[PDB]
Amino acid sequence: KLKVAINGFGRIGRNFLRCWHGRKDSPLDVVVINDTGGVKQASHLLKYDSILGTFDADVKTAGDSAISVDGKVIKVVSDRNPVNLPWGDMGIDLVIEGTGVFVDRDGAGKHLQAGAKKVLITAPGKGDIPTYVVGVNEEGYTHADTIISNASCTTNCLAPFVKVLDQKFGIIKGTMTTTHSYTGDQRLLDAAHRDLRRARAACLNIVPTSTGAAKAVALVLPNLKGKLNGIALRVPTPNVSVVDLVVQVSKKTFAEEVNAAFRESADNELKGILSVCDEPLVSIDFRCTDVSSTIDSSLTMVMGDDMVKVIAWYDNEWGYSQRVVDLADIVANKWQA
Amino acid sequence: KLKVAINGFGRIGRNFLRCWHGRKDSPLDVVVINDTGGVKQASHLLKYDSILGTFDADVKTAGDSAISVDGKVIKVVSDRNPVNLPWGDMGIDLVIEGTGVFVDRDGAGKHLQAGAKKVLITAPGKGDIPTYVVGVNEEGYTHADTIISNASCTTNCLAPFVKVLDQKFGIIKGTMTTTHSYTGDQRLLDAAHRDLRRARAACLNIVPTSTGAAKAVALVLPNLKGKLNGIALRVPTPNVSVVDLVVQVSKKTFAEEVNAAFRESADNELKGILSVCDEPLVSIDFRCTDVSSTIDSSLTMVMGDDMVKVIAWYDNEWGYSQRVVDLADIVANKWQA
Amino acid sequence: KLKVAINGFGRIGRNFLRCWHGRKDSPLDVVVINDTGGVKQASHLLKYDSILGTFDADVKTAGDSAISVDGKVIKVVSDRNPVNLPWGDMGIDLVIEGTGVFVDRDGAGKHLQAGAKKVLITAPGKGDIPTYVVGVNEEGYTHADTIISNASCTTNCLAPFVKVLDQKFGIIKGTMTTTHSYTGDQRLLDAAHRDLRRARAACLNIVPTSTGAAKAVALVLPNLKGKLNGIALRVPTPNVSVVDLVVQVSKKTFAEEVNAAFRESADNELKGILSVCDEPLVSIDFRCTDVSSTIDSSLTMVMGDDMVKVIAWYDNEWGYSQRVVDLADIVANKWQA
Amino acid sequence: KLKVAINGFGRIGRNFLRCWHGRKDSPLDVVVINDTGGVKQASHLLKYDSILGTFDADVKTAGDSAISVDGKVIKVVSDRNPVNLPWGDMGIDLVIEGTGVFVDRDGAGKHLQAGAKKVLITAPGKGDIPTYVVGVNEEGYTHADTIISNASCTTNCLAPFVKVLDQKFGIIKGTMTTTHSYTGDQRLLDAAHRDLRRARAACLNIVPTSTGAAKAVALVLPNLKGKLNGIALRVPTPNVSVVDLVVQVSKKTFAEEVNAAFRESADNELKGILSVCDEPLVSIDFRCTDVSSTIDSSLTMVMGDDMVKVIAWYDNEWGYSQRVVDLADIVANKWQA
Numbered sequence A, B, C, D: 001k002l003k004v005a006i007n008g009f010g011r012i013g014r015n016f017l018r019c020w021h022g023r024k025d026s027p028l029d030v031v032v033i034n035d036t037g038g039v040k041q042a043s044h045l046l047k048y049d050s051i052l053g054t055f056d057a058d059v060k061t062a063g064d065s066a067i068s069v070d071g072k073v074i075k076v077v078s079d080r081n082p083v084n085l086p087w088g089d090m091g092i093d094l095v096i097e098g099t100g101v102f103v104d105r106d107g108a109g110k111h112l113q114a115g116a117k118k119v120l121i122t123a124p125g126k127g128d129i130p131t132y133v134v135g136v137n138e139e140g141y142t143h144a145d146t147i148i149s150n151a152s153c154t155t156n157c158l159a160p161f162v163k164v165l166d167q168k169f170g171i172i173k174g175t176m177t178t179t180h181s182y183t184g185d186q187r188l189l190d191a192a193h194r195d196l197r198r199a200r201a202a203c204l205n206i207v208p209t210s211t212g213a214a215k216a217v218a219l220v221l222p223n224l225k226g227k228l229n230g231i232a233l234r235v236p237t238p239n240v241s242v243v244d245l246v247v248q249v250s251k252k253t254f255a256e257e258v259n260a261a262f263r264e265s266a267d268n269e270l271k272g273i274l275s276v277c278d279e280p281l282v283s284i285d286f287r288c289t290d291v292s293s294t295i296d297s298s299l300t301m302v303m304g305d306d307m308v309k310v311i312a313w314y315d316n317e318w319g320y321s322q323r324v325v326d327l328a329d330i331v332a333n334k335w336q337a
């Protein structure tokens, strides 16, 4: 019964909507979308998708102010300035912020000035903004938080299994590297950008760039403060990525024992969040997986009894979006005013 | 000898600079560049290129207002609004307009307001603007023209051999299709765009889109008005494109006679503009060619004695830029004021 | 009810299996497969596919001589020489020849020697072999034919609408060009090949190459003998292709009249074979379509009243395979011995 | 004055020839090539290259038994069976084995039965075959070795800087991962292969596969026996790769100190073998670098004083080939019988 609004109808915004549509007995009601591109555009791009394929639902425009999905009508507005949105007039409870532009209190707060009661950022928050990762620390959320963050795709892949390792072996220190698919922040052909590396043609290069997933894990898992670091390598694939972690543990072990620890959690406290694959698969095989992290068992190695190396896959668009849905579900169940 | 300013340091802007740098005894002198990205950005992207390779010349930043190439210094400015540019102050003779946004008389004229003397648009002009194609109708240029156009890359490939075909056999009617490399106007991943086809992931699809080259040919070749039309298909390659033309002629002929007609021109009036290749090559082999169009002789066909089909290659970035330098040299040699 | 054997478990071989599996009440029964790669390899590549996605059915290896799909068991054999195959022993009725090496009577006949009853080649036959295209001339099939051909993917896309155009307007002459996805006959990196163009890196170039579809059309449509010719351009996409046809007709017409003629057929005699699309889509949107050809109505053009240009899409892997299943059903319904 | 023969004219074979051609005062003389593809093919693919570009030399066929480069004539033969090659008759001193098929004594020995005096394998040798890496242990080579190995591209990138780290900090143990461009061993489209992962479409996936560079380093650097391991990830780029190493050292240090150690060696004992780059570059920027390893300084990290992480680039085709040339040069200088 929570009235939800989506601000920014891009890759995550559209993946969010399709993820929600597939749920059963949802406590959420999507009633409005702010797409600065218009009604025709919103309808066309929701129906046709180069990554997910054609949406199996009857999608069409409704007048010049809305669209409909299998009969359910959804209002569409268009304004680049949040302060002018009709949130108060419509009675919006929660705003899904997926523009990538209003990631700080100053910006996200504009939605509050317009009347919305709460805001959820689909990315790391800038400054003193509460950050949560489902399966790791969501129990710390309270109805008093007016603005929250669901972290990044990379942090949602790491956090889960890093927690299992620290509790069953004790992490002393480590480092990680992620081979990530390209995103809209990169350039199609060599062009201007703050990051001189992200300025180079994306379908043609291996592009190194910084990452904050390192210290982001420390936020959701206090024990790991100042114990990890890392970088990222952007490659020529449209979706699906992988993380490579190497850590030093206090408890001597062996590869076969580490995989056992993972399978146990995936079957209990992390069922639906973590998974373990024992087949020789490739990136494309992990498209549309609802979990946020999948361990590639055959690649697990242990050198010198204490140096562990782990490899895990993750659908950065779809898997992350299922998590945004879960967090929004928590906001609903904890609502009191 | 002629003061030249470059407005817009993108793909065409940077290619133009390198094309000019390699010329011997040039009547042009580039003294300033307007890069709304920064002195270092212009410096970095000029030295390193994903398509042309590393620039063979010592490139460096000369302070916070200029850069250095093989010693020479070139000022760098940043201002999205042309009316406020120091053109009149620097005594600029010609401005190379390559931003892709100021194509009409009002927009382009703003350079004249800033104090510039003449403007040359690296794209099709809108409205009442004289268009020229070297080798087709450049002889009709006059120093009196304050604003001119060099047409599109596709038009520069078509015009040259269409002219030969009309003079030798007489064109009645025809149609065209260009399989073109992707450009900056397209999107890396499904995203908002006025053209619902160009909005789709460029490195993943074959994308049909409109083209104006057909009607543009009639501009430089009046006898062809109303005789041609066509379309374009954008594909997953970063540079180099190909044209496929089918026309019905008044004089019966055959494949080898058509090829020979093209060779006579390439050896005479169109030397340096048109070429004929007899080897079995592919697109990558035509990168960095100086001509505007190259006929693939073994693909030429004639059906029913009067329906001719021709296939021609062209480097849309480097080939077109060499023609920009050529048209600029004509302006310099025609200065009588 | 009909014993079918699959010789060659490649792209076409595996697509055929999945196409058949989805049919309702099939008169065919696949009992054996000849994969010179192994029982597990056939098992692994059948379940996981980079183009079709994960097969939705429980696939498993049934020993060292067969596999299991949704319970059913299918024998697996390995023998590069057909003459030594247990066809006669298993009482095989029809053999689906999809290796691409046995296309003539001698080569294909070896299946008859092994004891097979009939053979159907998933490619153009060489010499004196009857060729059929569903929707064009399948009515001319007879149980007496021991060896038949289903033509190429391009021919199956062209024939259907060329037939409509000839009956309605009368074709005098024409030319064609197909922008086709790359296939297994090409090379990943520059390497030895009889065709010096197909020897070049496939994911990096636009590659011109010969095609036989033009002359092949005359086989199924005798009235077109000597009226068409054409070429092909291979581009960097893994599947889905498009045809561009230009013809001169005897009866004057216009674009919308041509489109309407195609719609009448799609709604009647060619339902399930030909379709007409009025939306602004791209290649990825046509993946997994069951028809042989789809007209892109907004691209149709007519120059000088009698020169018609048509653009049509086709899934070269999945679309063609559905036609293989259709021709196999005809053989089953025509069995009179 | 060493008479050399090249067996297998693929990517490495052709890169080898162009590398040699560019040297000054070479002690080698290439007189014959075994290309099972023929004279026309050998001439065409040497002249045109999708990665290196057009060879700046006059290349053509000479009769039907040879080719010429800038006037120098080179004989061409074609036979898949080494025992039948005219090595003894021609007086061949050294054979460059780049087929990827005769990597063991049994196979490579066939060249010795045919008359050649020595053989050099352009890949890791199988079994008890002497292995060398220029800049690390070439001083151990002696004229008595009849068959030798130059190791793999990955080992030539690692070995060099691993040596600098162990001598100035002391390596206790470590692990590595290499993000490598695809090669001819992979499949263009999902097809049969021993490695079920290498069987999947290469321009479309991130493909994990095993590597032997781990224990290969121990061969050229005894101190590191049983101290390292690792894996590989194949991505959608045509050439140029990168290595990521993480090791535990006995001497506490910091990132800035590690880079200093590298710059020192690159300027002395490893000049021409190792390099250090301090700019924000991308993969394409390292094409055609003659060194075998380039450290990306800005990416160097140190966690907990003793856990070091290093990132280095390498042109797997060209850089490796320059090393094959150097090793062959050593064979010449140490020749005595």
Ligand SMILES: NC(=O)C1=CN([C@@H]2O[C@H](COP(=O)(O)OP(=O)(O)OC[C@H]3O[C@@H](n4cnc5c(N)ncnc54)[C@H](OP(=O)(O)O)[C@@H]3O)[C@@H](O)[C@H]2O)C=CC1
Pocket: A007, A008, A009, A010, A011, A012, A013, A034, A035, A036, A079, A080, A081, A098, A099, A100, A101, A122, A123, A151, A152, A153, A183, A184, A316, A317, A320, B191, B192
């Ligand atoms: N892709 C992924 O893997 C993940 C992305 N994210 C984060 O989500 C955010 C968006 O990323 P993503 O969906 O990937 O990218 P997209 O560019 O696909 O989506 C961003 C959208 O914001 C729209 N937009 C920008 N400003 C406005 C505005 N002021 N008003 C209305 N619409 C606006 C853009 O429209 P326009 O087309 O005009 O640019 C674009 O459609 C970023 O914060 C990103 O870091 C987080 C996790 C995963």
Ligand SMILES: NC(=O)C1=CN([C@@H]2O[C@H](COP(=O)(O)OP(=O)(O)OC[C@H]3O[C@@H](n4cnc5c(N)ncnc54)[C@H](OP(=O)(O)O)[C@@H]3O)[C@@H](O)[C@H]2O)C=CC1
Pocket: A191, A192, B007, B008, B009, B010, B011, B012, B013, B034, B035, B036, B079, B080, B081, B098, B099, B100, B101, B122, B123, B152, B153, B183, B184, B316, B317, B320
């Ligand atoms: N690429 C090709 O093959 C050809 C392109 N053209 C034409 O050339 C033009 C540009 O195309 P292209 O080089 O491909 O594109 P690019 O985006 O590479 O270059 C255009 C540049 O204009 C800059 N820019 C935009 N507005 C301004 C402004 N108002 N003031 C200063 N700088 C500005 C843009 O900066 P920013 O990035 O900040 O937006 C961008 O750098 C178009 O007219 C195009 O049709 C013609 C022939 C060939």
Ligand SMILES: NC(=O)C1=CN([C@@H]2O[C@H](COP(=O)(O)OP(=O)(O)OC[C@H]3O[C@@H](n4cnc5c(N)ncnc54)[C@H](OP(=O)(O)O)[C@@H]3O)[C@@H](O)[C@H]2O)C=CC1
Pocket: C007, C008, C009, C010, C011, C012, C013, C034, C035, C036, C079, C080, C081, C098, C099, C100, C101, C122, C123, C152, C153, C183, C184, C316, C317, C320, D191, D192
């Ligand atoms: N791909 C497409 O779009 C279409 C292809 N076709 C045609 O179908 C045929 C095959 O093409 P395609 O599926 O694309 O190619 P694939 O290589 O994917 O399939 C061909 C298969 O034949 C197997 N094979 C070869 N010889 C034998 C043999 N003697 N005995 C047993 N198995 C053998 C090959 O095995 P191995 O890998 O060991 O060499 C390979 O697996 C060709 O005639 C092609 O023109 C027709 C329509 C569409």
Ligand SMILES: NC(=O)C1=CN([C@@H]2O[C@H](COP(=O)(O)OP(=O)(O)OC[C@H]3O[C@@H](n4cnc5c(N)ncnc54)[C@H](OP(=O)(O)O)[C@@H]3O)[C@@H](O)[C@H]2O)C=CC1
Pocket: C191, C192, D007, D008, D009, D010, D011, D012, D013, D034, D035, D036, D079, D080, D081, D098, D099, D100, D101, D122, D123, D151, D152, D153, D183, D184, D316, D317, D320
């Ligand atoms: N590419 C790289 O990065 C490196 C490769 N290597 C090694 O070098 C070897 C070749 O690799 P690469 O050049 O990359 O691959 P290629 O396939 O490009 O080269 C191998 C060549 O061997 C030819 N060939 C195979 N058998 C014979 C034969 N019996 N007689 C004559 N010619 C034959 C093949 O011809 P055909 O076309 O008929 O297949 C092919 O042209 C392998 O051992 C590989 O591991 C080592 C370092 C680097």
